[PDB]
Amino acid sequence: GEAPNQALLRILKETEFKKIKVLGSGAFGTVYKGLWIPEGEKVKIPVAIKELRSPKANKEILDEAYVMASVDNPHVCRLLGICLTSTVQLIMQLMPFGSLLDYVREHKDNIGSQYLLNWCVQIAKGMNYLEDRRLVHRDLAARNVLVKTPQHVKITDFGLAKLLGAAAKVPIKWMALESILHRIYTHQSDVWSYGVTVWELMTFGSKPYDGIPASEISSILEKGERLPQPPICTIDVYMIMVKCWMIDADSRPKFRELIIEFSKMARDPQRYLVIQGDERMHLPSPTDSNFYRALMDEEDMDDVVDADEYLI
Numbered sequence: 233g234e235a236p237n238q239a240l241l242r243i244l245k246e247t248e249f250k251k252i253k254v255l256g257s258g259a260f261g262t263v264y265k266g267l268w269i270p271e272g273e274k275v276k277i278p279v280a281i282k283e284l285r286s287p288k289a290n291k292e293i294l295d296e297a298y299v300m301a302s303v304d305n306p307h308v309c310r311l312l313g314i315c316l317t318s319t320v321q322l323i324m325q326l327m328p329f330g331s332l333l334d335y336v337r338e339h340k341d342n343i344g345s346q347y348l349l350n351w352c353v354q355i356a357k358g359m360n361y362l363e364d365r366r367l368v369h370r371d372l373a374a375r376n377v378l379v380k381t382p383q384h385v386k387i388t389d390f391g392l393a394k395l396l397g398a399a400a401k402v403p404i405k406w407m408a409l410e411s412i413l414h415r416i417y418t419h420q421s422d423v424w425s426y427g428v429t430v431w432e433l434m435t436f437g438s439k440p441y442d443g444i445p446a447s448e449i450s451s452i453l454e455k456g457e458r459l460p461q462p463p464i465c466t467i468d469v470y471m472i473m474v475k476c477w478m479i480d481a482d483s484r485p486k487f488r489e490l491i492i493e494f495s496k497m498a499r500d501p502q503r504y505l506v507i508q509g510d511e512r513m514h515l516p517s518p519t520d521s522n523f524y525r526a527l528m529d530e531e532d533m534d535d536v537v538d539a540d541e542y543l544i
C-alpha cells in the first residue's frame with residue numbers, strides 16, 4: 233500500500249569509465265576503484281564499481297540496485313547507475329578512506345572524542361532516514377560504514393536490505409536476539425546492531441565477542457551477558473549502548489532519539505569520552521586536487537567532481 237516508487241534507474245555506458253584497481257575481492261565478487269567520464273560532460277567522477285564473477289548473480293545485483301536507486305541521503309551510500317555487462321556492474325560513489333572499521337584501527341591513536349561522537353550522530357541519521365523509507369538494513373556494522381572524509385561517513389552494503397512489515401552467511405555477533413532465534417527483523421533490530429557498531433567504534437575496532445563461537449552467542453545473550461564497557465566510555469555512552477541491547481525491542485532507543493542524545497554529547501565531547509591526549513589530535517582530510525591525483529593514479533584531475541556534486 234506504499235506510494236509509487238518513481239526513482240530513476242540510470243543505465244551507464246561501460247565505455248565511459250576506467251577501472252583502476254581492486255579494492256576488495258572475494259567469492260561475493262570484486263569491487264574496483266575507478267573514474268567515470270560521461271561523454272561530453274567535462275567531469276571525472278571517482279567511483280567504486282561492484283561486479284560479480286550466472287543469472288542468479290544478476291538477480292541479487294539488481295535487487296541491490298533497486299534499493300540504492302531509491303535512497304537519497306547524505307549518510308547513505310550513493311548509487312550512480314548500473315552497466316549492462318554480461319554481469320551487471322553497480323557504479324557507486326568512491327569513498328576514498330575505506331571502511332570506518334579499518335579507518336579507526338589504522339588511525340586509533342589520532343582519533344578523538346569529537347570524531348567518534350559525530351560518527352555516531354551521522355550513522356544514526358542514516359538509519360533514521362532508512363526507517364523513514366521503511367527499509368531495514370540488516371547488516372549494520374562498522375565494516376559497512378564508509379568514510380568519504382574523516383568528517384563524513386555513509387552507510388553502505390545493502391546486499392541484505394529489505395522492506396519492513398514488522399517482518400523479516402548471517403553475521404551473528406551484530407544481530408538482535410530475536411533475529412538470532414526467530415529470523416525477525418525490524419528497525420529495532422537495526423538499533424541492536426547500531427549498538428554493536430558504536431561499541432566497535434568506542435573500542436577503536438575490536439572484534440565483538442572475540443574468540444567466542446557464533447554457535448555460542450545466542451546463549452550468552454540469553455543469560456544476560458553483553459559486550460563490556462569500553463575504557464574511554466563514560467557511563468552515559470555505555471548506558472546508551474546497553475539500551476540498544478535490551479530484550480524487549482520496543483524498549484530499545486529509536487534512531488531519532490540516538491541522533492538527539494549523541495548530538496548533545498558532541499557538544500561537550502570530553503565529558504562523555506575519556507581519551508588520552510584528546511586536545512592534541514588532528515586527522516588529515518586533503519580535499520584538494522593533489523589528493524585525487526594520488527588516489528586515482530592520474531596526472532590530470534582538474535575536472536574531478538565528487539558524485540555528491542554531480543546531479544542531473
Ligand SMILES: CCS(=O)(=O)n1cc(-c2nc(Nc3cc(Cl)c(N4CCC(N5CCN(C)CC5)CC4)cc3OC)ncc2Cl)c2ccccc21
Pocket residue numbers: 255256257263265279280309324325326327328329330331334375376378388389390
Ligand atoms: C562494504 C561491503 S561492499 O561490498 O558493499 N563494498 C563497498 C565498497 C566501496 N568502497 C569504497 N572505497 C574503499 C573501500 C575500502 Cl574497504 C578500501 N580499502 C583500503 C584499505 C585496505 N586495507 C586492507 C587492510 N589492510 C590492513 C590495510 C589496507 C582495504 C581496502 C579503499 C576504498 O577506496 C579507496 N568506495 C565505495 C564503495 Cl561502494 C567496497 C570496497 C571493497 C570491498 C567491498 C566494498
